[PDB]
Amino acid sequence: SALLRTGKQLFETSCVSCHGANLQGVPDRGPSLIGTGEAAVYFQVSTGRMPAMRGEAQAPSKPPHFDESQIDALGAYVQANGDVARGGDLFRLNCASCHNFTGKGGALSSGKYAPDLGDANPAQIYTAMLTGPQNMPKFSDRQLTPDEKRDIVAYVRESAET
């Protein structure tokens, strides 16, 4: 499992500056998690004041804010809690409104492509869909079932890789 001692020390070193379970930059978004999960807290928020620290692709780099064991440990510490046909139809019904043509509703320049998503992978997309980023509301539980989330994540991933 992820080491919660590493998770606490990583929180203190890199996130305590803006987050004491609160948020000093957007007040209401600190203890506010939509469809909160280990996978979503792990995934780098694509929009807002701070971008995900992970280097592109999760490759070793000289400016990473963290390695993978550090990410998992902190995502776990924060998380105390105390078919491509289906994928295409789900995309059209729920996500085409802001992401028609692979673009971004908030910014025309911003896109759902891998260059825009950097070190993207299916798990990172699934997670942001589940609980989602700041721009798009959470989809799990509230709107879409696990098969539908899995299928829409796969469709977005295949469209962006190709």
Partner 1 sequence: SDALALGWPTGITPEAKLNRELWIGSVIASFAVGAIVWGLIFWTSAFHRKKATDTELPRQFGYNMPLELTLTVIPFLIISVLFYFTVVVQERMMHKDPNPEVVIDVTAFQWNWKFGYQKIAFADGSFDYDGADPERKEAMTTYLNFDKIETLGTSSEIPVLVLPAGKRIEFVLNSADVIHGFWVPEFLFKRDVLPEPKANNSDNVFQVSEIQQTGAFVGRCTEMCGTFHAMMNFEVRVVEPNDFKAYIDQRNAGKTNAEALAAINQPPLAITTEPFESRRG
Which residues belong to the annotated binding site for heme c?
15, 18-19, 44, 49-50, 95, 98-99, 134, 136
Question: First vs last Cα of the chain: how many Å apart?
Answer: 34
Binding partner selected for residue 96 from partner 1, ligand HEC, none, CB under the kind-specific 5 to 8 Å limit: partner 1
In the annotated binding site, the residues are: 15, 18-19, 44, 49-50, 95, 98-99, 134, 136
For residues 138 and 132, what is the distance between their CA atoms, to the nearest angstrom? 5
Which residues in this chain contact ligand HEC in the complex, by CB under 6 A? Answer: 14-15, 17-18, 33, 41, 45-50, 74-75, 78, 90-91, 94-95, 97-99, 104-106, 112, 116-117, 125, 128-129, 133-136, 152, 156
Binding partner selected for residue 46 from partner 1, ligand HEC, none, CB under the kind-specific 5 to 8 Å limit: ligand HEC
Q: What is the smallest separation between the CB atom of 68 and ligand HEC, expressed in angstroms?
A: 12
Triad 10, 15, 17: Cα angle to 5°: 130
Q: What is the smallest separation between the CB atom of 84 and ligand HEC, expressed in angstroms?
A: 13
Tokens found for residue 65: 């804010």
Q: Tokens 């070193």: give the residue.
A: 13
For residues 137 and 126, what is the distance between their CA atoms, to the nearest angstrom? 13
Which residues in this chain contact partner 1 in the complex, by CB under 8 A? Answer: 83, 85-86, 88-90, 92-93, 96-97, 100, 137, 142-143, 148, 151
79 has which bridge partners? none
Q: Are 16 and 78 in contact (CB under 8 A)?
A: no
CA-wise closest residue to 72 among 138, 11, 154 = 11
Binding partner selected for residue 152 from partner 1, ligand HEC, none, CB under the kind-specific 5 to 8 Å limit: ligand HEC
